[PDB]
Specification:
This is part of a larger assembly, with one copy of chain A and two copies of chain B. Chain A is mainly α. Chain A has four helices and no strands. Chain A starts with 10 loop residues before the first helix and ends in a 20-residue tail after the last helix. Chain B is an alpha+beta fold. In chain B, 45% of the residues lie in helices and 13% in strands. Chain B contains two helices and six strands; from the N terminus they run E-E-E-E-H-E-E-H. The chains are: A mainly alpha, B alpha+beta. Chains in contact: A-B, A-C, B-C. Chain C: It comes from Homo sapiens. Chain C: It is found in: Nucleus; Chromosome.
């Protein structure tokens, strides 16, 4: 590819090798999400400012009833929350799940009732909320 | 049918005016109920038909203009381009409106009003209608204000997050660039070292 | 009501461009990570072969 096996790389040759490699975005977002997560763990690349809304372990309420993936009501920013949930590196999850570790009250703050009602089904508690600051507590 | 809050102030008396409670037939050229009240007496009324062609030879308008003429005579004030007399013949319980154009005056249609007393109840109904429509308009006002400010804050938040994301895509691009560069540099260092090790016999 | 509609459309267009920029970031990160993964796989195979030949020595 032009990427040597002995002489080190720079920005220019890395970009040229990458572009020479075929454009590679066709798989499901979650498989490559896990791949990015694993590479960040192995290579200490979790330090990216983008690392908390696109790949792994965050919960939210994007629906008037959770476990009901079909209800949608205007009057809040559920769409914007979904649009954000695909950016930094925490997984799009707004369904009753057990293995999820992060629960975050959404911009639709009226669903604190729903958040807590399905929190009983959850094994993780809600934190006092604060990329990482719209209404969030992943710390 | 429909009541409308429109007071065509009668030149003959100020204590009575034709409020609009129009029960319009197939056309306003046809009869409909107009109730004018005093507080001491009330009067409904209907318009006699055919009163359209009387101006047809007079000013030579076109058909259907009588419908708009009647509607704007019923609504508050006179016609924007049609002269009307706003009064009431209490003696005969009758209303009339004018129509003049092209250098000659003429007499438009008229209301053959019918006297129905007890102005108290009809005035109560009219003022209740006023209060209720004010209340519904205020409710629409406050709802529109709420949704407007909600979309305002939504717009501000999405602007902020969009700016964050447009900076961040290139930020992570360059970060991943340098990260891959250094990782592959270390891989090449390992390859060089292993080559040197293999060089030995 | 007019202010409501104009702010609705402003929020909608900025959320749409937010969609566009977020998706562009996703695609760019996907490309970068995938191409780097392929290069790193080549590097690791080369390192493995070097280990094999050094063992054969």
């Amino acid at each position: 590819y032009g990427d040597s096996y002995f002489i080190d790389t720079d920005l220019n040759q890395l970009k040229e090798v990458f572009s020479g490699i075929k454009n590679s975005n066709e798989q499901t977002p979650e498989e490559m999400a896990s791949l990015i997560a694993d590479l960040e763990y192995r290579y200490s690349w979790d330090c990216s400012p983008l690392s908390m809304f696109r790949r792994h372990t965050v919960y939210l309420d994007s629906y008037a009833v959770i476990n009901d993936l079909s209800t949608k009501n205007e009057g809040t920013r559920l769409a914007i929350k979904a649009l954000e949930l695909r950016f930094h590196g925490a997984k799009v999850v707004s369904c009753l799940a057990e293995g999820v570790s992060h629960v975050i009250i959404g911009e639709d703050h009226s669903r604190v009732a729903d958040f807590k009602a399905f929190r009983r089904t959850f094994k993780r508690k809600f934190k006092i909320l604060k990329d990482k600051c719209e209404l969030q507590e992943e710390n | 049918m429909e009541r409308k809050i429109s007071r065509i102030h009668l030149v003959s008396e100020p204590s009575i005016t034709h409020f609009l409670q129009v029960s319009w037939e197939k056309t306003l050229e046809s009869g409909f109920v107009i109730t004018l009240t005093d507080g001491h007496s009330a009067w409904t009324g209907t318009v006699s038909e055919s009163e359209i062609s009387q101006e047809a030879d007079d000013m030579a308008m076109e058909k259907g203009k009588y419908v708009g003429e009647l509607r704007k005579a019923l609504l508050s004030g006179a016609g924007p381009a049609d002269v009307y007399t706003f009064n009431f013949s209490k003696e005969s319980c009758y209303f009339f409106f004018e129509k003049n154009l092209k250098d000659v005056s003429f007499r438009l249609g008229s209301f053959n009003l019918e006297k129905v007393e007890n102005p108290a109840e009809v005035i109560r109904e009219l003022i209740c209608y006023c209060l209720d429509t004010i209340a519904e308009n205020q409710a629409k006002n406050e709802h529109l204000q709420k949704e407007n400010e909600r979309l305002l804050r939504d717009w501000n938040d999405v602007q902020g997050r969009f700016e964050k994301c447009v900076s961040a895509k290139e930020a992570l691009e360059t970060d991943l660039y340098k990260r891959f560069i250094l990782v592959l540099n270390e891989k090449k260092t390992k390859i060089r070292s292993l080559h040197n090790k293999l060089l030995n016999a």
